[PDB]
Amino acid sequence: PAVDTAEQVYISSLALLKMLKHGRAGVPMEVMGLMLGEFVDDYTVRVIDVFAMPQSGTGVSVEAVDPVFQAKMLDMLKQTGRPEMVVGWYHSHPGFGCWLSGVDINTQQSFEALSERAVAVVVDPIQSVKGKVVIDAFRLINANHEPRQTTSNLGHLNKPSIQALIHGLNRHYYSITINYRKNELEQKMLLNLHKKSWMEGLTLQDYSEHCKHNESVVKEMLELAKNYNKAVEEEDKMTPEQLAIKNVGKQDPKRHLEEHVDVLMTSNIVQCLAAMLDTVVFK
């Protein structure tokens, strides 16, 4: 009779990627799907996979068109080794942040009536960037007191967003921490994704193109050095405040010289070292 705040929803890498891909595909709509998983203990709701369902709607609503597909998909996944059953649903809010609306709350009410601990996950594709993905998990609060019991600090570590608070967080629903537990093979595959072929490492680079690039950058550095000489004469006839706005709309010879130096050093050192390594390795 508690539902604790240390409860977490474990989203697999596959589930997260599927959710984000479907949401981004349906950028103007709130495309939606089901989440399969297990209810391990009272402190874990494991989400292992998600599958989209046939649905149609406008930019103001989206609804599913057939339940036969859902039943058949559950059966045909069980037949291949995924006996997990639905533990919630996911739908995308493209740019509105993460929260539930009235229709979302009604759907979550139906899911709660079916299974007590069902959860809803809102993933916002467009606001997601490379480093971070905007995603949250929710569950409803009855018409009562405090919705949950706190036996740790784990719940109060997220600082709920102003948009979610405006749209009803901690009043009509509460959030659940999302965790990304992975297995060894998932970790290894994610690390190996970006690994390149071995031959690419030792492959050299056309010397004509390399010399042309070096020549171009040195020619640019010449003019940058002229401008740097001009700029050094300043910085004494400049107000302490005026210096900051001095480099607004105007080139910075020092910064550009540093960048060009870095690129030239990297390219030339790499090429020379690769040349020597090949010279020894290949007879």
Partner: protein, 73 residues
């Protein structure tokens, strides 16, 4: 019940507008399920472009409660 719903959704304050056009639109190609929109496709009738008195133009995939053939630019 449906008539009651229509009446309650027809709340009196309207915004006068002029019908700029009555375009004819047709579906383009197959739309993948999971993400298919009833407006961009699956709409074969007549669509209206209107200009509200607030100087705001709008496209109406569904004309509304007035039959299309009656409206003229």
């Amino acid at each position: 019940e449906n008539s009651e719903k229509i009446k309650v959704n027809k709340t009196l304050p309207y915004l006068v507008s002029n019908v700029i056009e009555l375009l004819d639109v047709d579906p383009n190609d197959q739309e993948e399920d999971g993400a298919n929109i009833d407006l961009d496709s699956q709409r074969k009738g007549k669509c209206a472009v209107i200009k509200t008195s607030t100087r705001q133009t709008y496209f109406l995939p569904v004309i509304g409660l007035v039959d299309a053939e009656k409206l003229k630019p």
